Every structure is written in structure tokens, then in C-alpha cells.
Symmetry: D2
Subunit: 121 residues, 4 copies
């Protein structure tokens, strides 16, 4: 047995403009995996949501086609995670977003790149 | 504003044996994104959890180093998703897991590959 | 100093039809890296070329948007590599190709997934 | 029929120091694909070679475990490509390298992330 893995039970949107987004969130029990670390799916979901927010901030609608994520350092209970996303490439049908998560000590937690398909304006 | 994104509010483990895992789950409202489709992070978390289950089934402990996911077809409210994970490569220090999600119509929803780091036995 | 890294100085196309491609090639000196193993770029290029051939076999033109590759086992001088590609998903604007390389002993060398953008028919 | 795809028929190492590498190269006919653009495999090989150079610059020996690449803008015959590699994370067992290619106009051509396995020192 294991409990649900949840993301964004709390959050603060610090910045959302012109393809650049910054959101903060506190790691809580529902964020964790078996080993007491922030779940890789939780961390990914933080990144994917912020990637979507980057899309919206460009006046676009979109869907993720593909994503790659690298895990660098564990997130822990009560960490404050800063999720920074930006559009590195704005093409006609597709956008590429980089999203980076750091903890309250400025340490790198994970980095992801999203390939989004622009569906409309 | 947006509500939390959650994964495994419900599930059934069908198979978990020697590097092969099958788990089913039903898509619910907490699974969805802005547009009413299964959230990319939700789908990834389904895959990531099953990847870790594959690791455990091998009598191993481990952590995800890197993952890539491709989104093929939308997941919808009330879909039953089958999450199939396989260890396609068991190295000494790392394992590589393929995870595929199909819906109740047999349609491919997404595919991911996980690069896991074996921490212990 | 280092010499050029080259791919397809020799090859045999065994199969090319309906989204399924099989090509063989022999690892030669220009294939190798500093350590005497098949260069990761060489192996990737084998996969990317076969992904393109899968596109053509579907009566399409296309360009790669994104690719992810996992390296499983070293390729060595004089290995015969079998490169098998297939379209796992044929969407309207994009295709997803899986490409797998095995050696003459049937051992898995590397696996890659390509997200291609369909440019025309 | 198609001719071999080659990388580093010419190059200039501009910088190679403590985890940071810059290398330039000019796109030639052997660099290109069917459509006359820089081959995705050629571009990846440029990135992969520079990733390994980053590893060496850290006094390390290593092998690529996994890589992801995004293609942003076509490379063309006679372009001068600048290949910039950085170790963004030096773990104990693995390193993560970001590699970016820009052309002579400062335009972003592609970006890749490499997950390297440290074999020795």
C-alpha cells in the first residue's frame, strides 16, 4: 500500500510574464516517496505545471509532447522549492521550456525541458 | 488559481514480479489539467511510481536519475489506465525501466523511460 | 586532437516498409571514441538516420524535434549492429519512433526515442 | 543510398577548463541530411563530443548513460557553430552536462543534456 502523491497543495506565484514564471511551494508529506524524499513524480509535476504557466504567459494554449527531467539533489520535508520556468524557444507549432527547481539554500534539485505543442492563441 | 494535482487516489496492483509490474487506476477530477485532460504530471507520476515498483520487485532500492516521457493520446475523466513497467536493462549501478500507459480501449496514452540509480539491495 | 567521428561508412538496409526499418552496419575505427568504444554520437546517429528512414517509409517527410537515448552496453570494433526502428505513434503533426540497437550476439546496445515533426506527405 | 555522416572534419577548441568547454566548427557537406540541413545526428555528435571534453576537463573519465536533445533551428552549409558545454551538476557517481549550439548569427540551433557516468579520475 501507498498513499496518493499530490502536488500544489500549497503554492505562491511570484512571477508570471512574457514567457517567464517563478512559483514557490513547500514540500509536505503528500509530496514524498517511500524513502522520505520528494517523489520524482511530484517534482516533475511541479515542473510541468510551471511549463504550462509559461505557455499561458505567452498568450498561448498548449499541450506537452515530450519532457525530459534530471534529478540532482533530493527534496526534503519542509523545503521551500522555487520553480523557475522560461521559454527558451518559441517556434510556430512548438515551444521549448526549461524549468529548474532550487531549494531555500539555493541548491539545485532538478532540471527539466518540455517540448510543448501550441494548440492555439 | 488551480487545485492540487494528485495521483493514486485509487489503484489496483495486478502484477509485481521480478522486474515486471502492472497497475491499473481510474482517472478522476484531481488527475486533470486546465483543459480537462489527464495532467502531464499526473501521467508521469503514474509512470514514475510504477518504475520504482519495478525496482523493488527486483529486490533493489533505487532513485530516478533521469526520465523522458512522450505523450501520445489524451487521458480523459473515467478512463481506466493500465500502467505497465518493465526493466529493459539491469546494469550494475543503474537500471533502465520502460513504462507504458494504455487506456481501456487499448489505446496508447504515453510512454516513458526511466534511468534509475541502484542505491542498495 | 581527435579525428572525425563518422557513421554509415558501410551499411545494409534489410527492411524498409510501413513504418518499420532494419539496417545493419559494422563498427569501424571511425566509429570509436577515446576509450575504444563505439562513440555515443555514432550510436545516436545510427538511430537518427533509421528514424528518418521510418518517416520516409510512411510516405512522409519530417524533421526531428527531440530525441532521448539510453546507452546500455558498449559497441566494439567489428561488432555488427542491427538498428531496428518503428513508428510507435503516428499523429497528425508529429510521429514518435522507437529505435533499438543490438549487436551480433543479440545483446542490447542502446535504445532511443525520436519525436519527429511531419513537414509534408 | 546515402553517404556517411561525419562530425569534426574541422574544429577549433577555444576553451577547455574546469567543467567549461567551447568548440567551434564549420558545417560541411558531410554534416548534412537528405534535405540539406545539418543532420540531427551530426548536431548530437557535436554535443556528445563536447560533453566528454567537459568530463576530461574535470580530471574525470566517463561514459554517457543517457542524453536528451532538442532541435530548435536548422544548421546550414557553411554555418559556423559554437558548441558550449557546461557541467551543471557534479555528483559523486554521475555528472550532468548542458551543451548548447549557436550559429554565427547568435541563433540557437540545439540544446542537449547529458547524463554521464564517472568511471574513474
Amino acid at each position: 500500500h501507498f498513499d496518493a502523491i499530490s502536488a500544489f497543495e500549497n503554492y505562491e506565484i511570484e512571477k508570471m510574464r512574457d514567457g517567464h514564471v517563478v512559483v514557490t511551494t513547500k514540500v509536505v508529506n503528500s509530496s514524498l516517496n517511500y524513502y522520505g524524499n520528494a517523489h520524482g513524480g511530484y517534482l516533475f509535476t511541479l515542473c510541468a505545471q510551471i511549463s504550462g504557466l509559461v505557455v499561458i504567459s505567452l498568450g498561448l494554449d498548449g499541450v506537452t509532447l515530450q519532457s525530459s527531467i534530471n534529478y540532482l539533489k533530493a527534496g526534503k520535508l519542509d523545503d521551500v522549492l522555487t520553480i523557475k520556468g522560461e521559454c527558451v524557444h518559441q517556434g510556430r507549432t512548438t515551444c521549448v521550456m526549461d524549468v529548474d527547481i532550487t531549494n531555500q539554500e539555493g541548491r539545485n534539485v532538478c532540471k527539466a525541458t518540455f517540448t510543448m505543442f501550441v494548440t492555439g492563441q
